[PDB]
Structure formats: C-alpha cells, structure tokens
Design a protein around this ligand. Structure first.
Ligand SMILES: CC(=O)N[C@H]1[C@H]([C@H](O)[C@H](O)CO)O[C@@](O[C@H]2[C@@H](O)[C@@H](CO)O[C@@H](O[C@H]3[C@H](O)[C@@H](O)[C@H](O)O[C@@H]3CO)[C@@H]2O)(C(=O)O)C[C@@H]1O
Ligand SMILES: CC(=O)N[C@H]1[C@H]([C@H](O)[C@H](O)CO)O[C@@](O[C@H]2[C@@H](O)[C@@H](CO)O[C@@H](O[C@H]3[C@H](O)[C@@H](O)[C@H](O)O[C@@H]3CO)[C@@H]2O)(C(=O)O)C[C@@H]1O
Lengths: 171, 171
C-alpha cells in the first residue's frame, strides 16, 4: 500500500503521483518535489539523454529524453513506451528485446495481448508458458528470466529461488 | 510492497503481473489465473464492452474492448490509453475529461508533460497549482478533486480530509 522506493517501486493507478514518502495522491504534496512516479510535475528524464533509462507508468520517452503522453512524447522521434510507431524486435531486429516486458510478436513488433503474447511470441511476457531446463533440452528463457526447478520461465522467489536452473537466479 | 486489491491497486513496474494474492512477478503463477494487473495472460475487458472501464498500466483499450499495446490495441478504433490518435478534451470537446488524470492542454488534447500540464492546462494533473475555495472566489477543482483547507486541488487525506471545501471530500 506504499509506492516508489518504499513499495518496491509499485506504481499508483490512474497516474496518481507517488510522493517522496511512498504515498499516492494528486497535488503538489505528491506531484511536486520528490515525486517518484505517476504524473510528476517535473517529467523524469529518459532514453539516451538519461543512460538508457525507461519511463515509469508506461510513458513514451520523447526525442529529447523526457517522459509523458501526447503527440510531443509519443509522436515522432519517440524512444520508448507505447510509441506511436511500431517498435520492432525479435530475430527480425537482431534479437532486440521489447522494453518493459512487452511481447515480441511472431512478426517482430512489440505489444501486449494475444496477438503479441500468443503463439509465435519471441520474448517478453509471452503467455505460451514454454519450458526450459534439463527438462527442456537445456534451453534458457529470454529476458534473463528464471528457469525454476520445474522448468518454467518467470520472475519471483519461486522462480529465481532454490532449484533455479538458469536466468536471474537469486544468488 | 503489495499489489492489486491488497496494495490499494498499486501496479507492478515493467508490466510485472500482480497475482491473485497481491505479489509481483512474471510467469504463470502471476500472469496466469487471478492476475489483477500488469501483463495478465488474459487481457482484461475495457471500454464500452465493459461498462466504461479503463485499462490498468496505461493500456490502450482496443476497439473490441480488450487491453494491450501494439497496433491492434493502440491503433484505429482504440478507445482509451495512449491511443495513437490524439484524444480530444476540454471546452473544445464539450468539457470532456482526459482519462486516467491526463492533462487537457490549452488546445484540447490529452497528455502528460509541460506541454499538456503546463500553462493553459484545462483539467487533469495540471502542474499549475491553481487555487480553489472561499479563497478562490468559490471555484471548485476539476476531476472532482478535493479543495483542501488551504485552497489547493489534490487527492489524499490532507486534501480530501478535514477542512475540505469541495471536491471528493472524505465524508
Ligand atoms: C516534448 C518534450 O520533451 N518536452 C520537454 C521540453 C523539450 O526538451 C523541448 O521543448 C525541446 O526543445 O522541454 C521542457 O523542459 C525544458 C525547459 O525547462 C526549458 C526552460 O524552461 O529548458 C530546457 O532545457 C534548457 C535548460 O532549462 C537550461 O538550464 C539549459 O541551459 O539549456 C537547456 C536547453 O534545452 C528544458 O529541457 C519544457 O518545459 O519545455 C520539458 C518538456 O518535458
Ligand atoms: C485486438 C483485440 O482486441 N484482440 C482480442 C481479440 C479480438 O476481440 C478479436 O480478434 C476481434 O475479432 O480476441 C481475443 O479473444 C477472442 C478469442 O478468445 C476467441 C476465441 O479464441 O473468441 C473471441 O470471442 C468469442 C468467444 O470466444 C466465444 O465464447 C463467443 O461465442 O464468441 C466470441 C466472438 O467474438 C474472443 O474475443 C483473441 O485471442 O483473439 C483476445 C484479443 O485480446
């Protein structure tokens, strides 16, 4: 029930702003100074301009390296987020990984839903629960996900914990 | 450090999925059944098709009323989220309110950043801290925000609590 650093980076809903304290609301108290996510009065820096950084709340990183929504951010030159132009990926775009766990469709585009996450899904939050492990002819997940002791790709204690065969195994 | 119903609707970061229990991770345990937000294997229903409902994680509500990202969702017929076409608002579009607290620019478009939230901002997470109250010639905030005892628009205990002049005052 806590956001930002004090909520393991949880994010408020409806772009509610997360104050410097880890509470959600709207207004200067939250959106003003120390804001850590949501609709912070001061756009956070992103993209090139800010060491490869991604925006929170699924924001489009404008060409200038500022986070937001609207033509200016999502529009031309956009560098991350639900960018107005199809973000490419997969074996089509040299192994490229969708940002923010998005699915790399069979076709080489980034998204979320059956069309992207479904059959053919190359990387990201594929819903095709494909197997890994000794169990899966020594195949490692994508996104450096954890191959749990049952040969399943995911992120968490059950996945990254004990019996973790490969991926980002808690060490 | 808890999501969904057990985290006052906090949302995991990077589209991490929130399990039926209120924990964040990636995989079937979280993305499978009971998923409450993030990249849930099963798209949540939205728009018309689902009583005016908005998608979580700033997702585009496709023409069919399913939440996601990518051309299919964000593209033509899109009904909410960082839709690929400019969502209109403000006095230009009959008082329309941007969804998900987005700013209604001076021009009548929805977004987030200086360009939308800045000078002229009509409604939403305007960063122009305009005043309300007896203090402000009996002017009420937009979005049914709370006019605190100091004549400030916001959402929270300090705003919606005691001394709340108008808005969604905790009652
Ligand atoms: C769409 C987008 O990214 N909007 C940004 C813009 C853009 O970066 C910009 O419009 C592209 O030209 O900038 C905003 O921040 C700028 C603003 O604070 C202005 C002054 O108010 O300065 C810009 O940078 C200056 C900086 O202030 C100086 O200290 C420095 O000496 O020069 C810099 C030259 O760029 C800020 O980037 C804006 O409000 O216009 C923020 C939007 O999110
Ligand atoms: C972009 C988008 O919204 N993608 C959805 C699609 C679309 O709703 C669709 O492609 C537009 O035609 O549908 C997805 O769900 C559908 C899928 O489960 C199929 C069958 O696997 O059925 C569709 O609805 C059926 C429903 O299953 C039947 O019980 C009912 O008798 O008829 C319905 C007629 O539409 C689902 O909508 C999909 O996976 O294709 C989900 C995507 O998010």
């Amino acid at each position: 029930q806590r956001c930002g650093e004090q909520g393991s980076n949880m994010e408020c809903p409806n772009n509610l702003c997360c104050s410097q304290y880890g509470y959600c609301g709207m207004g200067g108290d939250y959106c003003g100074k120390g804001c850590q996510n949501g609709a912070c009065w001061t756009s956070k820096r992103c993209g090139s301009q800010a060491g490869g950084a991604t925006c929170t709340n699924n924001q489009c990183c404008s060409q200038y390296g500022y986070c937001g929504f609207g033509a200016e951010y999502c529009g031309a030159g956009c560098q991350g987020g639900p960018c107005r132009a199809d973000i490419k990926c997969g074996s089509q775009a040299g192994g490229k990984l969708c940002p923010n766990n998005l699915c790399c469709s069979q076709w080489g585009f980034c998204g979320l839903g059956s069309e992207f996450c479904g059959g053919g899904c190359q990387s990201g939050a594929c819903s095709t629960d494909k197997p890994c492990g000794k169990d899966a002819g020594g195949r490692v997940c994508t996104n450096n996900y954890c191959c749990s002791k049952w040969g399943s790709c995911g992120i968490g204690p059950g996945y990254c914990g004990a019996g973790c065969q490969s991926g980002g195994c808690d060490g």
